[PDB]
């Protein structure tokens, strides 16, 4: 179906330390494929997906130089932001940046992004039209002014609509077996007595990909949205994800409830019901 | 592939 490529960058100042910590990671859909850690020994962009190891020396040297440049730019940003907010050099602060593109089922450009945050909150973001910026506060107005004067959006739009989508396509092809796959969830239900007149029913979805999934409980045909305990979708560690939803029901009424699982890996949604 | 030209805030 639709796909995306995204790069995430985190830079953390470390007062008393010689250099801040910079970590960059790249993803195609829900699969990470590269990483860089400024504290690491190699000082090079590293492969984290089998299909990216195919790229030659030219690719790696280029990605390494560009990521080291990113690191340097963010090292400067930390100081700049401390100034915009007139903060002390004594505290640790965080900068995060994310950019990438989305393509539709036809693998053609759908949307582009470039967002930035300081200390966990929105700072500045490129609007959907890829022509203007949204500044979160007064401080960010200086950056907005700076980026408008240097025509940043225009130069960036070219990457988002061109380079980004072109490499995403190349990755989707080179990593077909991995990226263009869907692993349908393996589902099952567990029963756990609670009180003496109550029991917990837990619906499980395991080993699925992509991460997008919908688990819902119903009691005699009606949604139990409010009374459903749902956990965040979590990584199994092997490239697939997991999730569960639970409801507490009166003993002897378990059969009245049904769990519904929706995932693109399923030809049709599944319905599970407790079976003694 | 990473963006090449990045601008400071």
């Amino acid at each position, epitope marked *: 179906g639709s796909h995306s490529m995204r790069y995430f960058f985190t830079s953390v100042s470390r007062p008393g330390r010689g*250099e801040p910590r910079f970590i960059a990671v790249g993803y195609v859909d829900d699969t990470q494929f590269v990483r860089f850690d400024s504290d690491a020994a190699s*000082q090079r962009m590293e492969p984290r997906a089998p299909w990216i190891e195919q790229e030659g020396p030219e690719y790696w*040297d*280029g*990605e*390494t*130089r*560009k990521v*080291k*440049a990113h*690191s*340097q*730019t963010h*090292r*400067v940003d930390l100081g700049t932001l401390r100034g915009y907010y007139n903060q002390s050099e004594a505290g640790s602060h965080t900068v995060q940046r994310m950019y990438g593109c989305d393509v539709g089922s036809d693998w053609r450009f759908l949307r582009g992004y470039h967002q930035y945050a300081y200390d966990g909150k929105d700072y500045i973001a490129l609007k959907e039209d890829l022509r203007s910026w949204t500044a979160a506060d007064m401080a960010a107005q200086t950056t907005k002014h700076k980026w408008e004067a*240097a*025509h*940043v959006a*225009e*130069q960036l739009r*070219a990457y988002l609509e061109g*380079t980004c989508v072109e490499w995403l396509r190349r990755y989707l092809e080179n990593g077909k077996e991995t990226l263009q796959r869907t692993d349908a969830p393996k589902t099952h239900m567990t029963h756990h007595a609670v009180s003496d007149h109550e029991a917990t029913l837990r619906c499980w979805a395991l080993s699925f990909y992509p991460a997008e999934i919908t688990l819902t409980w119903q009691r005699d045909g009606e949604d139990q949205t409010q009374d459903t305990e749902l956990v965040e979708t979590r990584p199994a560690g092997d490239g697939t994800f997991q999730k569960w939803a639970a409801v507490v029901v009166p003993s002897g009424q378990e059969q009245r409830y049904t769990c519904h699982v929706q995932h693109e890996g399923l030809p049709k949604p599944l319905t599970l019901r407790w079976e003694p | *592939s990473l963006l*090449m*030209w*990045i*601008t*400071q805030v």
Partner: T-cell receptor, first 113, second 112 residues
Framework: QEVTQIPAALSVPEGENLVLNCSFT??????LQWFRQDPGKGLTSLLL?????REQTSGRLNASLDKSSGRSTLYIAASQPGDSATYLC?????????????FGRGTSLIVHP | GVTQTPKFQVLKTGQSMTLQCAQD?????MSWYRQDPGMGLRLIHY???????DQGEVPNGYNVSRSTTEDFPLRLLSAAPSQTSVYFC????????????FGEGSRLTVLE
């Protein structure tokens, strides 16, 4: 990947409006910069045109960029003896990861008093 | 701006020396060039940030280091007559307009 400046030499009477040419083989550039250098001296930046833009002006100097045609033109109005120097044109790559500029060999200009 | 020193220097063959280049614009990119008659400007070494340096067109005989954001020293461990030239340091952002800023130049003559 190759920047050329032809004519490589130009002689003009004071007061005339002149035109200096720049050509590059790869249109994927981030910007184009014009400089002037006098013998025994350093390089002074004149104009910088970003690849998304069309032209830049500074006093009697005006330059245009035609990225699709792989060319740039530097115009100097009402030339003066002091404009005499070697004008260099350079471009930087949009991609690649080196950020290394490519310079033309320049056009030597002499404006006769 | 960009400040490079010394402006003039004489060296005997085999002597070592370092040309300094400092910039206070927070530029990530810094580089060194040598310019000689009929050769144009040739890139020696460059750096896109602290802790990274790469070879240019004519790296042989020169060494650089980028321990800090502001400085990009060019060192000649053992000066040779072929290194007599005019050296230019150039810096810029790795974004924004990407404008290059050249230092004033350093003239070096290496004699036997």
């Amino acid at each position: 990947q190759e920047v050329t400046q032809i004519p490589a030499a130009l002689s003009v009477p004071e007061g005339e409006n002149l035109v200096l040419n720049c050509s590059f083989t790869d249109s994927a550039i981030y910007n184009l910069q014009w400089f002037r250098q006098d013998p025994g001296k350093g390089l002074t930046s004149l104009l910088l045109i970003q690849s998304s833009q069309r032209e830049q002006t500074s006093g009697r100097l005006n330059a245009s960029l035609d990225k699709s045609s792989g060319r740039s033109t530097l115009y100097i109005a009402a030339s003066q003896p002091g404009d005499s120097a070697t004008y260099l044109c350079a471009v930087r790559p949009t991609s690649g990861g080196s950020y290394i500029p490519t310079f033309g060999r320049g056009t030597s200009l002499i404006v006769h008093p | 701006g960009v400040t490079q020193t010394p402006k003039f220097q004489v060296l005997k063959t085999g002597q070592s020396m370092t040309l300094q280049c400092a910039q206070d614009m927070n530029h990530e990119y810094m580089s060194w060039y040598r310019q000689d008659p009929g050769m144009g400007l040739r890139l020696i070494h460059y750096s896109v940030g602290a802790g990274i340096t790469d070879q240019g067109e004519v790296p042989n005989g020169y060494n650089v280091s980028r321990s800090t954001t502001e400085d990009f020293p060019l060192r000649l461990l053992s000066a040779a007559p072929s290194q007599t030239s005019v050296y230019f340091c150039a810096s810029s952002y790795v974004g924004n307009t990407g404008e290059l800023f050249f230092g004033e130049g350093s003239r070096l003559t290496v004699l036997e």
